[PDB]
Amino acid sequence: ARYVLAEEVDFSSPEEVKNWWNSGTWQAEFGSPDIEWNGEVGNGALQLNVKLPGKSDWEEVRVARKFERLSECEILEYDIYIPNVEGLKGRLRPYAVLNPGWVKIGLDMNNANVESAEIITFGGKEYRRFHVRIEFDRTAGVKELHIGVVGDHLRYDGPIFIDNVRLYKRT
Ligand SMILES: OC[C@H]1O[C@@H](O[C@H]2[C@H](O)[C@H](O)[C@H](O[C@H]3[C@H](O)[C@H](O)[C@H](O[C@H]4[C@H](O)[C@H](O)[C@H](O[C@H]5[C@H](O)[C@H](O)[C@H](O)O[C@@H]5CO)O[C@@H]4CO)O[C@@H]3CO)O[C@@H]2CO)[C@@H](O)[C@@H](O)[C@@H]1O
Ligand SMILES: [Ca+2]
């Protein structure tokens, strides 16, 4: 099948951040501010301030945005960056959800142990980089994309960044 890019969010400007909201948590917490713009990471990225205790297999924080063409789309991609602090252990289990309908997509398709990760550099600082690619079916009536950042025995108190959110549809 062939696809074109329908929507893309690169967070080049802080005014994009108002389109995103905190859609909840599960066995994890947001700090304050929960979500903010960061202009160094990714030349602009969405910064989630999180606290994951690292005691269970599913410790989730979630952000969301409306996308008018979401019901026409079939592939989602995004990047997650985590500061390359020494000693971090555990697994990320990132996924996403389409709503209305709370349609969970990509469950356990992009899981990554943090210990053996690609790195990327911004501003002379290193970040662990995790790419997420999810295929799904055209889903009628959906209008919101929720991105779920999930830790699995990943004890971490600090920022996690999202960037390069891309949605593709068929030509
Ligand atoms: O407010 C918005 C929205 O929230 C809804 O509630 C959400 C809630 O906030 C959470 O996001 C919750 O999250 C669940 C995930 O969707 C998913 O179901 C996840 O499933 C995991 C599971 O926990 C477990 O880790 C499992 O591990 C397995 C593994 O699959 C394999 O079988 C292996 O062999 O065994 C292990 C161990 O058993 O893997 C699953 C993923 O594949 O569980 C999360 C915790 O429950 O989802 C809720 C919705 O279901 C609602 O309040 C809604 O009303 C509201 O709109
Ligand atoms: Ca960016």
Determine which residue's CA is closest to atom 49 belonging to ligand 1: 102
Atom of ligand 1 nearest to the CA of 93: 41
CA–CA dist 156, 38 (Å, integer): 19
Method: X-ray
Strand, helix or coil at 16?
helix
Task: Give the bridge partners for 4, in sequence order.
Answer: 169
Task: Report which of 148, 165, 130 is spatially closest to residue 63, judged by C-alpha positions.
Answer: 148
Bin 50: left if φ > 0, else alpha if -120 < ψ < 50, else beta. Answer: beta
Which residue numbers belong to the known binding site for Ca(2+)? 10, 42, 44, 163
Q: State the DSSP code for 155.
A: -
Domains plus CATH for the chain? 1-171 (2.60.120.260)
Q: How far is the CA of 68 from the centre of ligand 2 (A)?
A: 21
CA–CA dist 158, 30 (Å, integer): 9
Q: Are 46 and 19 in contact (CB under 8 A)?
A: no
For residue 58 and ligand 1, the question of a CB distance below 6 A is answered with yes
Count Cα neighbours of 153 within 13 Å in the Cβ-side half-sphere.
7
CA–CA dist 34, 122 (Å, integer): 22
Question: How many angstroms is the resolution?
Answer: 1.6
**CA R_g for the chain:** 15
Q: Report phi then psi at 34, rounded to 5.
A: -70, -45
CA–CA dist 121, 123 (Å, integer): 7
Task: Report which of 157, 134, 156, 6 is spatially closest to residue 68, judged by C-alpha positions.
Answer: 6
109's tokens: 């398709």
CA–CA dist 49, 149 (Å, integer): 11
CA–CA dist 6, 164 (Å, integer): 13
